[PDB]
Amino acid sequence: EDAELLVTVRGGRLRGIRLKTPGGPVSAFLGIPFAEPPMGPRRFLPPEPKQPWSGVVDATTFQSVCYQYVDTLYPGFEGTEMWNPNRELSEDCLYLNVWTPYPRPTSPTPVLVWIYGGGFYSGASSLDVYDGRFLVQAERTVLVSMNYRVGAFGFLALPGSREAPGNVGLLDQRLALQWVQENVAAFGGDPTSVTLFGESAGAASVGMHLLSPPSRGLFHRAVLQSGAPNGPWATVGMGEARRRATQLAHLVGCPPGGTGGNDTELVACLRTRPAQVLVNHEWHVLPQESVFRFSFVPVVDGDFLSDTPEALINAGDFHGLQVLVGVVKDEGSYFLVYGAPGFSKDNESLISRAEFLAGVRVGVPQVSDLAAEAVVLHYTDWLHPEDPARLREALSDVVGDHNVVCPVAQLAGRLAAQGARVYAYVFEHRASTLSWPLWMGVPHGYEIEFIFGIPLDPSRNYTAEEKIFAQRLMRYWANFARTGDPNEPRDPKAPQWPPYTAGAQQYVSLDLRPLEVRRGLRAQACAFWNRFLPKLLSAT
Amino acid sequence: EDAELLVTVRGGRLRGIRLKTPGGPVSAFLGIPFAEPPMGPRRFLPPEPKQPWSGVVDATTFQSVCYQYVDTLYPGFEGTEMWNPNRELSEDCLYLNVWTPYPRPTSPTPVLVWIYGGGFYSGASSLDVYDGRFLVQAERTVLVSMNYRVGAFGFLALPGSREAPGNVGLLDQRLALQWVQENVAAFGGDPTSVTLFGESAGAASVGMHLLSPPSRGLFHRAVLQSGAPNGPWATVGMGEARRRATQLAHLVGCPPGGTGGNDTELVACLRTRPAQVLVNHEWHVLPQESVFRFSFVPVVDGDFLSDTPEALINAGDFHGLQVLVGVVKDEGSYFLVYGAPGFSKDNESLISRAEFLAGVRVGVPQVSDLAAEAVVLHYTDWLHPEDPARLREALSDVVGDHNVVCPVAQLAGRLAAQGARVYAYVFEHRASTLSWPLWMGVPHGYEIEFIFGIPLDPSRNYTAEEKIFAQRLMRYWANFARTGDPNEPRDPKAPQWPPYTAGAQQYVSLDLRPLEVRRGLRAQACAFWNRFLPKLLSAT
Ligand SMILES: NC(=O)c1cc[n+](CCCn2ccnc2/C=N/O)cc1
């Protein structure tokens, strides 16, 4: 037994495991319980801190994945199954993982806290692409990642009641952040240099912690990848959250016909149902047929979020804060094979204009007929209004701009103009091992494997240029964690990454080629979403 | 060493296995290849007989399941998992199984041949509910069950071409019937007393072998359980079969962008696609939103079926043939949860009047607005036209009568009036271990476990009375297989089972109570489907 695999924390002792990288070993502590199991009477309730334990807790393997829907659209397909749970499903899932270099750093080291995405209905910290053994070995930093409750178990909200207050999945993340403040020093980490970074729903979660006062004192830097809290999918109304929760209870037989009419007996009936029963009816509570919309998401309850995320961003101070935001080239292509008519991953998806007009109503739900007419005007090439290849790219840009790119550009503009130093990027490299069709380009979620240094894994068929590209990306994220600046504090030979300002709107392209500075995060297209369309809906 | 576990057939030698029953041992020969693997260039082609092999083929375990869609509507639910494949999926699946008593019968024994159901898109002969160790031990008969290609691999039809002629899944069953004629004597079976029996799509398959001359001379008695070849779901036209096959090719990228669209190049493109790719787009070719409809079913091609099953039944002679038909009480309740609005297995499914009107358009597709009005009249109790419990039962009877009961009642009428001795039953016992909700009553598919003597398995939690009831049904089915008459030839004390005639229309009820003769297989309801509705559609 080695001396660096035994660590004592405020709850007790843990035995870690020594992972192996092509360039040196690394210590890991996988499966640390940071909360009591939210089972039985504690379902839908905020997390309670883990009670101290006797003996040594085995932290050599990942723990259970929180109960979640499992994607069955393309069974056996690598592109979809790489995001499915790789452990057993259980409500006993509130566990975090810590990677630390070997030998353990004798000086305090910056800490990176990863929050997985998955539309607030799925995801796990044990996926292969979230392996932090390569980022910790190459850049000698401390990586922490936790599981949080997703779906109804983490975001079912009956606003007003105390049996289902909502946003408990966000409280799972906050409790894990407090755990890092109280225990990351035992692993060689600096609790005064914590960098939150997440992707999609994790990026939205990172943004919601910026807007929540109790969570702001737990980290110092933020990285939002392909997501933002002001997105049209990230939050839901107090009344809509009550309707979605009530219909879910109706589908599972709650309340028993017909006694009961208050939230106390409604939640009491939900707590008796098996976990899989609630999951099988999760998608049946959405109001409309749509893509990029999810049943149970964070709610604006006045507690965790005192107001809407857009309001908190406009009227907030962000001085002394470094933020790194960015998107991929084709944000919307991934979500079109999940409901848009005429789209299939097994053909070229050469849609007609009739299918394009129907896809706009699916990609942009809850809009008037006039608002839909404005969308098809701005995204139609009127020289070739019937070209299937251009209509395919157009609908991909419609979903991408409406859901990811423009809410990110809106957030990045307000952050830089209110004190924060913001850096922006656009990931434009398609991995050579990508199993999705070519017409999707660089889809949503496929920059994560390069940030985590997955191409360094010799058992995978990546190219030599992609391995160098992975190390360069790991340097950017690490430099931003230590200094708050992605540039190398002493490098003059490499091109510089200029900050993003509301006026110049400068960003860089991440590719196999060196850095290239550009201007405008789709400024012309996002002016329609952020400026005009709000006013087009105010007048019905 | 047991000598009765080594059998030589016309292809080679086989090593069997001796299974255990609470009343004695039984020899089993599971996984006997009866055809060459239909892979590569043989996909969509008729089966070729298995060429003789050297050595000894191991017949001690079930072989692979044919490629098929897997139900993911209720993951982990016993009611649906029990029909999913229990072996690896592979196109190498043409294997049959033989159960024979120990000691091997020294006299020729009648042979039962089982054909599984599953809407021609799924099913396997290796399911636990199809285990023939109990029927063979208790009644000392020979039970044979085979796999046949389902879905597109067994019923994709481009009529006209020889690259995808259609009905090859039915030809897989015929080749297994010819195998029984040539080799069942080696197991102690009588090839002059072969009794076909299937359920749902298997029952329709048994009915289609009665109407095909080449298959007629391979068996002598037939049992059709909850299915008939004249059902609105069992067949499809040559034009519709071409449209469904062409769209499936389009969804998988066939033909390539700029290639000719003839049948030779189209089937050649489908043979290059992986098996799972064709399965993932199987349900995307149905024309309308409907229940109890399946993509690739047998086609009326003029070869296997010279005319429609309805025509061949009317213009056919059935003298010297004993048929046993029957249905369960609640045939339609199972299919409601797959798409009828307001239906869910986890609540009471107390639908409204508006949901009932929408469910009629789903349960009875392809009909005009006036035809749907007539269905609403016959199945609405106008004294309580909005009672949710009565509307739930009404839509269950709508789907049950339209798809199962009335197509069965018409088949039994024309058979008895044209020389065949027909016996009819109605299964009315709900199993005590049934996991489906109580409002479904006796769902479709849950009499099979009692015919196969599953309650005799000690590991199951069935009641004592259900074991005696299982032995009764095994006696009825065996007596029919032996003599063509389900009644006991030695016991005049038990109530007799009278034949079904076109005038008296007599049947019996099967439950824990003794036999009870009734009259009319939904005579008033089926007169609407079999007599009036065809005339209502002729005048549009
Ligand atoms: N069982 C169903 O009918 C069903 C419907 C919709 N979904 C939503 C798929 C997820 N999705 C939709 C739009 N974008 C996404 C995200 N995919 O990662 C799943 C299942």
Ligand SMILES: NC(=O)c1cc[n+](CCCn2ccnc2/C=N/O)cc1
């Ligand atoms: N949304 C889908 O991908 C889909 C899956 C399965 N189906 C068919 C389910 C099975 N079924 C439908 C109607 N009747 C049945 C019988 N099931 O046993 C339809 C659509």
